[PDB]
């Protein structure tokens, strides 16, 4: 039956599919290579057989299958799409998550994870002939890393090597894309930023970050420069902490440039005497120091627009105190 | 020479027909000359306390037409908002239409704005669709000024997990409409949400598709 | 790999059944937790059973029990619940747990101090994860236990002598005497707390 | 009736979804109910998913808006791979209630 199906076969394919569902319950139990090239290769009834294999086979069977999918160090034989969908389905079998409330984690070694990111790159290359698919497969990578710092660092250095080896290929550009997305999702890795990422343009478009809420909290917190001297020293800690974060991790701040623009738009018009008694000029000094640190990564297109708005606010303040 | 303070005489006349004609002349003159529009804003603000409701409605229409390209300051903004308590629902929706086109200086202005809007919700609940339109445009046009208010708006806590705010509550839907609309062009905003805000986002997506964007 | 195993499916089935039982009669949930069960099951039974937030309504009663093992289980169960449900009442019971753990630090003898603080010290990183406002109390308690255990170490000759290891580095990750073990446990939870706060 | 859809007990949610399915005739176009059907569709408990399917059948028979909203979810649910074969089988005949519109029927 498997040989007949692998060979076109219009009407009778359903009959044969029913047959090997009947006599091959665990699907890939008998003659595994035939079924492996059936389910994952370069067909029509493939999704049905994939569903059967996902929801019908023993756990050792699926473990061996994922070890096969991630242990092929020469092939590029299995389809990236089918393999990745299968992995996602296996993670999210309902039987594993039955009973969870669903209101607010797979272990894989080094080389398997490298094969996984290579398969994601294969997916990206097949689709490009968008960043949507590469972002879509990203939570699978994070569900396999499980937040392990060693795995994140290994993927990072493998991607650096892939960027360097591939030069500026399309796949190299996609390597940079998922590398910047990984840096966004896990900035705990304190690796200094290579210039290849600084030349990357896609960071300032639509994206998702893990620390943006915190730095947003930082800048709104520092902005409330009320009269309490304990709060004033707290604001000083906030300003220098943002200074250190700017020098250490600049790009996350660079997605918070319209933030500072809006923060400074508010207080520009108020008069000089109230300017000094409510202590807002210190906030201007702090953000000036920030931006002085943030160069020269503060000088790309969206950064240029936010800087233009901030400088309009600055010169408005300057003209506001010409006397 | 003899052309000093003519428009103020027209607006301080007793015939409401003269005042309507004068304020329409102000609308057309400000439309032709954008730089002129700054000087007539305060005079138009006083006309929102006029005696004849047609004069007030016409002043609101003029303001909506001419405040398109210019900015309000705080006192002018709150005086604009304070008339929302008026009983005439027609001038209320007209004022809402103004607020769709107004421009705010500072985030405290937006905070005062939607505080007044939800107070209006408590007062005149039947207008809630119009106020949601107002907030739709308010968020859609000041996205960068709405974002530093978001954690205050959602009452989010630094470490506690909050009670899921009651969905299909008109004030809360209004707040979400404002926040999601500002998030249409502010990619850093969604990570500041909570999980039930994503759930409520899906709910407002399907039920209020015309209001809330992707 | 835990997640993908027949053990995990069985755990989910048992969790669904226990959820039904606890909804039907919450007194059963209270009785089971007063008896206690292996602490290894606590992440499983706290994650998989949505009706365990009722445990927060009798953690104070479970803490008050004279048995040391009931107290230890109460601390561990509370730590897992706090990491799950970060509520104001959850913090109130966490404050009570830190207070009771700092209180009986001066009530227990040498052996009982070791027995109580080896399982309940990994609960402090969970409290600190859930509740940043506990940092002052947690580290004051931790420095108190550390000073007590260092004093106890100095009393007798030891094979390791952690005092002269005052300037050793991180030990990121077994026949030693209990006092040195408890000293190392205090250090270990301190690095876990600091790692958590910086990550 | 709707308040018990927030209960963490999946059997209570299942009975609630079936209740809303029984009440689809008198209160269609109740959008929070639609949202409950949609969220409960991709749940993990099997009884909750079946109750959501039954309620979806009833509401698709009643509401045109619900039918057009749910046809895409059903398509991505069948084409989804984590959905087992029997659930797919129960999920297909929701589509017999897409007779409200010409483009709906064509899709």
């Amino acid at each position: 039956v498997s040989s007949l199906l692998l060979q076109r076969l219009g009407p009778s394919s359903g009959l044969l599919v029913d047959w090997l569902e009947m006599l091959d319950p665990e699907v890939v139990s008998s003659c595994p290579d035939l079924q492996l090239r059936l389910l994952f290769s370069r067909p029509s009834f493939r999704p049905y057989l994939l569903t059967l294999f996902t929801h019908q086979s023993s756990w050792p069977t699926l473990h061996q299958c994922i070890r096969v999918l991630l242990g092929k160090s020469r092939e590029q034989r299995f389809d990236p799409s089918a393999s990745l969908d299968f992995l996602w389905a296996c993670i999210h079998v309902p039987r594993i998550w039955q009973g969870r409330d669903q209101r607010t984690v797979l272990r894989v070694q080094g080389p398997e994870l490298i094969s996984l990111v290579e398969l994601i790159l294969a997916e990206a290359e097949t689709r490009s002939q968008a960043c949507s698919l590469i972002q879509a497969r990203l939570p699978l990578l994070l569900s396999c890393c499980c937040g392990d710092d060693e795995s994140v660092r290994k993927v990072t250095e493998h991607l650096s090597g892939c960027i360097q080896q591939w030069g500026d290929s399309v796949l190299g550009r996609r390597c940079r894309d998922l590398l910047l997305q990984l840096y966004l999702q896990r900035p705990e890795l304190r690796v200094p930023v290579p210039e290849v990422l600084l030349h990357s343009e896609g960071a300032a478009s639509s994206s998702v970050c893990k620390l943006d809420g915190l730095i947003h909290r930082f800048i709104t917190l520092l902005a409330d420069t009320s009269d309490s001297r304990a709060l004033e020293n707290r604001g000083a800690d906030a300003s220098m902490a943002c200074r250190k974060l700017a020098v250490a991790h600049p790009l996350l701040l660079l997605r918070h440039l319209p933030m500072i623009a809006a923060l400074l738009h508010g207080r520009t018009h108020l008069n000089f005497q109230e300017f000094r008694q409510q202590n807002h000029l210190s906030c201007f000094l702090h953000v000036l120091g920030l931006l002085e640190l943030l160069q020269p990564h503060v000088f790309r297109s969206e950064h240029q627009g936010a800087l233009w708005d901030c400088l309009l606010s600055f010169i408005r303040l300057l003209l506001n105190y010409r006397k | 020479s003899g052309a000093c303070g003519a428009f103020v005489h027209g607006l301080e006349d007793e015939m409401y027909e003269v005042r309507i004609a004068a304020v329409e002349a102000l609308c057309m003159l400000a439309q032709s000359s954008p730089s002129f529009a700054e000087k007539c804003l305060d005079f138009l603000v006083d006309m929102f306390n006029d005696e004849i409701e047609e004069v007030r409605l016409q002043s609101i229409h003029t303001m909506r037409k001419i405040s398109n390209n210019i900015t309000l300051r705080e006192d002018q903004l709150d005086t604009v908002l304070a008339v929302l308590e008026d009983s005439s629902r027609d001038i209320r929706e007209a004022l809402h239409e103004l607020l769709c086109c107004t421009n705010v200086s500072t985030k405290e202005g937006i905070h005062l704005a939607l505080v007044e809007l939800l107070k209006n919700l408590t007062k005149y609940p039947t207008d809630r669709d119009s106020i949601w339109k107002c907030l739709k445009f308010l968020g859609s046009r000041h996205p960068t000024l709405v974002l530093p208010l978001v954690p205050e708006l959602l009452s989010t806590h630094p470490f506690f997990d909050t009670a899921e705010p009651d969905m299909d509550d008109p004030a809360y839907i209004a707040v979400l409409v404002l926040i999601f609309n500002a998030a249409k062009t502010c990619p850093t905003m969604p990570a500041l949400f909570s999980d039930h805000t994503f759930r409520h986002y899906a709910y407002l997506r399907d039920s209020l598709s015309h209001l809330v964007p992707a | 790999d835990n997640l993908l195993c027949n053990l995990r499916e069985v755990q989910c089935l048992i969790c669904c059944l226990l959820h039904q039982m606890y909804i039907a009669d919450p007194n059963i949930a209270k009785l089971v937790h007063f008896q206690g069960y292996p602490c290894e099951l606590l992440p499983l039974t706290v994650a998989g059973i949505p009706s365990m937030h009722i445990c927060l309504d009798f953690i104070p009663e479970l803490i008050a029990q004279p048995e040391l093992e009931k107290q230890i289980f109460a601390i561990q169960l509370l730590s897992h619940l706090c990491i799950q449900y970060a509520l104001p009442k959850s913090l109130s019971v966490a404050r009570l747990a830190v207070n009771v753990m700092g209180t009986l630090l001066t009530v227990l003898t040498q052996a009982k101090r070791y027995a109580f603080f080896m399982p309940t010290l990994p609960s402090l990183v969970s409290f600190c994860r859930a509740f940043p406002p506990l940092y002052e109390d947690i580290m004051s308690l931790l420095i108190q236990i550390g000073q007590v255990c260092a004093s106890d170490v100095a009393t007798q000759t030891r094979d390791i002598d952690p005092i002269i290891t005052r300037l050793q580095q991180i030990k990121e990750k077994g026949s030693m005497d209990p006092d040195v073990q408890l000293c190392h446990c205090i250090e270990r939870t301190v690095i876990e707390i600091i790692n958590m706060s910086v990550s | 009736i709707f308040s018990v859809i927030h209960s963490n007990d999946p059997v209570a949610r299942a009975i609630t979804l079936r209740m809303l399915g029984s009440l689809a005739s008198i209160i269609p176009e109740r959008k929070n109910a639609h949202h409950s059907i949609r969220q409960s569709l991709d749940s993990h408990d099997n009884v909750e998913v079946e109750a959501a399917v039954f309620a979806a059948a009833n509401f698709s028979a009643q509401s045109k808006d619900f039918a057009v909203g749910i046809c895409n979810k059903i398509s991505e649910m069948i084409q989804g791979l984590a959905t087992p074969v029997d659930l797919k089988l129960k999920l297909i005949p929701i589509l017999q209630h897409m007779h409200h519109d010409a483009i709906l029927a064509s899709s």
Partner: peptide, 13 residues
């Protein structure tokens, strides 16, 4: 109550 999460939307009679 054991049947409702603490963060669930409260029911107001």
């Amino acid at each position: 109550s054991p049947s409702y999460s603490p963060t669930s939307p409260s029911y107001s009679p």
